[PDB]
Amino acid sequence: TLPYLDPAVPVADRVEDLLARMTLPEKVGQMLQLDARDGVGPAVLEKHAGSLLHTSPENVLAAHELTGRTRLRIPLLLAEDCIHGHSFWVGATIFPTQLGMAATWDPALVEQVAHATAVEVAATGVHWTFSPVLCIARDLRWGRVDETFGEDPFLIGELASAMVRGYQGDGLSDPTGILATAKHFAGYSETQGGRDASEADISQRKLRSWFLPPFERVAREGCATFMLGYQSMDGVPVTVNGWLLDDVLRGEWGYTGTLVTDWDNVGRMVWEQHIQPDYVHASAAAVRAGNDMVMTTPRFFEGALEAVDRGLVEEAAIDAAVRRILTLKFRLGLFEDPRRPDVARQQAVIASAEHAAVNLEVARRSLVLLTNDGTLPFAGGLDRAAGTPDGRALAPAGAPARTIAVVGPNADDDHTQLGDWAGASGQADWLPDGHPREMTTTVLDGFRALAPEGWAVTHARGADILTLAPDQVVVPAAPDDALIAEAVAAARDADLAVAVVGDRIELVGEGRSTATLELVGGQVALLDALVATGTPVVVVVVASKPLVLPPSAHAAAAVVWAANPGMRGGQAVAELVLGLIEPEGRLPISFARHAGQQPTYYNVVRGQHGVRYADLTQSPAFAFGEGLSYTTVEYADLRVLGTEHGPDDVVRAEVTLTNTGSRPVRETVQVYVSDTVTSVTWAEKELKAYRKVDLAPGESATVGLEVPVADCTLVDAHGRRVVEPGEFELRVGPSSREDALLRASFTVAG
Amino acid sequence: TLPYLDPAVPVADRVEDLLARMTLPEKVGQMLQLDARDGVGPAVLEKHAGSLLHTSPENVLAAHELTGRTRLRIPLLLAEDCIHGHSFWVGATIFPTQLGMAATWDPALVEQVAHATAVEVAATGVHWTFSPVLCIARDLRWGRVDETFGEDPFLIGELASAMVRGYQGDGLSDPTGILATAKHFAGYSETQGGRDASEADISQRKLRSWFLPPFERVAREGCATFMLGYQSMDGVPVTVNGWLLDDVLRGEWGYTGTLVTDWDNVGRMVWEQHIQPDYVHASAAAVRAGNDMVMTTPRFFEGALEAVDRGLVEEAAIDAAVRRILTLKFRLGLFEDPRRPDVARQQAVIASAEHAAVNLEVARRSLVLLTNDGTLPFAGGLDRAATPDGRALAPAGAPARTIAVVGPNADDDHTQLGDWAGASGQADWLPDGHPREMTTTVLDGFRALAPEGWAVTHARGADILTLAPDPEQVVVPAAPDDALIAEAVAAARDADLAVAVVGDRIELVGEGRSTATLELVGGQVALLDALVATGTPVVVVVVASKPLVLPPSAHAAAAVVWAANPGMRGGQAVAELVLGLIEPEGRLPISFARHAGQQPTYYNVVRGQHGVRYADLTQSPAFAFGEGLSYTTVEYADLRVLGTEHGPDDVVRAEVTLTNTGSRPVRETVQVYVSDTVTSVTWAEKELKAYRKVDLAPGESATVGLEVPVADCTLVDAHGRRVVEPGEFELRVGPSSREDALLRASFTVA
């Protein structure tokens, strides 16, 4: 012999030979992507599924056996959520979440993480990850903020671009490449009330302005698949959204990759959004819109078959989607090698020492020091034994004996440190105990391993967070006088209190947005009492997203943001506190002071009558881009080199940095552009470029910076992204805070 | 002639005659509406103003003198903010705010309020009020919620229809009629962060769906003017928004009334929104867009002149605006009678007893009893001497009782009247407000009504705030004050009943004063906690501009009454209610959030959310649209649609049975909601469409007939058409918008 099995025959002729042999049920089934946890046998044999997701190691082997017993033996696409490492493979390298990764501001490193993930994913026989996420974190109430790269369209685009690159490798023939997905297209991250898949009140212009740019970038860079979002947008779910699917993705951008829906998009139009009377008309609606793969709506099988039989859609429309799906399977070479899992390759590459070292680097660079009164680096900073890199620190001069008290509900919590979409977070049913405990260094673990011989590390759970009850629902723990008293005693007998607080899985993710953003349970009372002991308190926030921190945390000696820092995360936190590394992370997202303060992202649109709420400043608790080091850096003398520009030029600038302190630093210079007068109201400023700079103590450097004129765009009325001629301002400094930015005018001419 | 001064000439010829005699500066000035507080002389003489606003009684007289000294003697239009009564005339009848009035659910009463306002306004020689407000209260953080009729489009349009009817009388030749204004067209109430005139992220379909219906209703019924909103909508300020102005207002609706901008709209495009480079260009943009009157942008004078001089716009464009302005003045008769103020009329009609009786009806019927554990009516309820104004009589079994009236708003007569009244700050000729004797505070109410044997004591129990310069003008919350609390606690310990009057005040309300937390500010929470702990029963009376988050102690107090700035008679109504001299009738026109992060909390939420609650908080409102208690129980029984199959010209007809099962009469407000079961686009779960007031004596049953025209069961589809889609519906009927309180019956539209 048959031509569809002949590798010497062109792919389009192979497609048409196979298609002509297929029954209509076999074609509809090729559009299904089914939940393997419900049983692989019926899915592959009775429904005739093209794809499976959530496939346990046992079911991956069973799926291949069942394909051999089907009439046409069309090989399966096996897809999995491999969200920050290979989430659901016991013993895989689990990296920080996307939000933590974004604090490194380092695309080259994020590419290494995606590549290391793909290497592990490929060995287990998975072909396709639903990753990266390109949603833009605009409402902190939203439960999936941890899955984003933050609040800035440019930074999201840089890092999402790096993940697609690293996942896909050299392309559809790379044995260590896998398909990447551009996820939640588009606008899923800003819906009414910060709720999960409520109405998105987003116009075409607002979508183009703040949400589309990362998607357009990865579409043009060859992202294999796009995933269509849950939410209705101006009344229309993305699944049947003609403007978004035809005018934008397939029209303006000319995207030729494969579409997949999100879990049960087609059925939700019946039972949750109430825009379709039944599943036959939902299926027909989905086919008209030009969908390819339909995820976890099993009744699309009988619904699309009946829709064809009744004349609601043509069989030709089924054919066109099947032609696209088969083309992908043929170009991957699956009919020649369907990329089975290889146990010899699993043992060679999964959780290898190279991958662990990439993981430690991301953890070290993702930590963001938000406040410091001088307590840190603790005892002036520690050294390791001169002979051995790594290993336990030496007791420094001026501090022979110290006691560090590690307290708080997240101080020794394996699962919470890894976050959602990993281990036992709940979406896979084959990892009851999560990943092996010994692969994670918790905060307590890290200090026990690093503290000098003559020091001591004590522990006390100081609070609980929550318990579950029936209306299912979270019950916040009460403050617990005994639990608190035990931590206060540990602190009273110590030189330093490290309080590790935050959230946990029942307060995070799908269907679990939060309204208050506050620490839940007895954590506030624990922080209050620890600060009142007079022992210096370091607040380490291990949480999925930015939280409102109580006053006692702003009165503590220091505050570290860690964002679910992965398996190495607790080694990095202890290294940071003891001064064995310098801090490098910088916020990719803003922290609010109260949920009602929002919006608190840096790129606010101009126009407000006033600058504050009557009962609250509009200034965020911590702003996008900020973060401390253990030294001081002066920014001086910003100059644009030739302030007049035409539309094809590059704005070029120079700025001078001086390290005026005593420790080295890797500084992240941020470059914002402001369009002084605009034809439609626009953001006061936008991030456009950035640069990392290494400074030895005392070193001084003049740094070149550039921004193409073509990047100084807005979305006008009419929805065109255009550079308008006129006056601009270049704002350069260590954060998005206006009192930290040097500024310089430039102009762009018609 | 001179035929312009000739009343036999038909108006179009008079306009043409006068237009041909006017120089260009005179024609531009006729578009100006200027701030008389800045200087009436230069406004009429140098700038040839066509209208004045914020005119004091002295300046009203001076303006008529100055007109007579001009070349062509063109009569001025004098306009004022007459928002709930004649706001800034010392001392007119000041009614409850619109938000308070809306709790009466009574358009006939609201029309009486507007007619009475208009009689007083006309005697003072104002021709035009900037009222009613048609914004929809969809974010509780907004500072101007008190100016709206709540959160529902239908009720808003009922009550604003009534205000326009009452203001305008029999038309332009009515001596007691004045011009109404449909205010803030459109979308000003829902902008980012709840802030004042931040960006409105509102698509065409969202605006058509929830904001436009009341504006379309009053434009169709003859509202004489429309005011264009401050805010930029999808990047375009309303002032230059061609879709809104030309396609919708002047296009689909064919509205021929007069337009005015809001305060400094034209100039804000330069200095606040940054969408115009200078005032010449701002003035040209405003002319091209079709504006009529330009409010408080004095530089529109030189700017529009330089714009014509440079050919940016044609003089005929100015001409067309003047024609519409002059046509109004002629039809008003202003050239034969400029409608001067008349002191004898002022003394005959302002604050007459008939207007005080209307005001007392509104205040009585607007209080909303939110909670009651049985403590109210107090001591089982009191009577008057069989003497409808005098003191109440001590009841059987309670010859001496002491009521402790406490709280910062218990005797604060400025906060009771609210924003847009007296000394709120927008007029500058009444620095002491209205005459103190015209206002009954809550304290005044109990002192005047308690029986002879009873006593009434008083303790301010908390302060709210003080002011301070910004810590780079600013509100500083009062700290809890132990001596002040102890004094109130001692009064409550010596009383039978403690009435705690709490809420907000002017520095936390209105323009530029949005709020983030919605909580009670200052020492009020500490006060309530302490009063509830005495063991004396506590009634919380909320005097506030908008719904607030109440502390847990308020939810544990015996009863809670919502008063929303109840006007000059409001303290009499509160006391009558607590003592049982009236029955409660009010019903909430807006929902109360439990936390600012819980929003949206309006009842008519669009379907689609994955989940029903935040992980840390229910989405159930603290109190919901339409609810409110009485002093008896009413049972809703047997809801029947009369024939279920309908066509687009039909009326849906239903009946429901109500039984008063308690001891006291009640005026019950039956609410009728319609749910469209399957919609072509995502829609609200239900919408209010009718209501009905039913009087029930104790023990009385009634079978009440309800009806909703089939033409009202619309949605806004994709394409932006408001249509009734065939399919299944549900009629939901009951005493509130809560689902567990609604009977349901389905009907079909073919």
Ligand SMILES: OC[C@H]1O[C@@H](OC[C@H]2O[C@@H](O)[C@H](O)[C@@H](O)[C@@H]2O)[C@H](O)[C@@H](O)[C@@H]1O
């Ligand atoms: O009140 C006039 C008109 O415009 C807006 O209110 C204007 C308000 O603006 C301040 O800048 C000024 O100091 C106050 O005196 C002034 O009244 C408002 O949005 C409209 O409701 C109102 O009709």
Ligand SMILES: OC[C@H]1O[C@@H](O)[C@H](O)[C@@H](O)[C@@H]1O
């Ligand atoms: O993708 C993983 C998850 O997606 C959700 O929508 C489903 O309800 C979960 O049960 C599923 O495991």
Ligand SMILES: [Ca+2]
């Ligand atoms: Ca510009």
Ligand SMILES: [Ca+2]
């Ligand atoms: Ca319908």
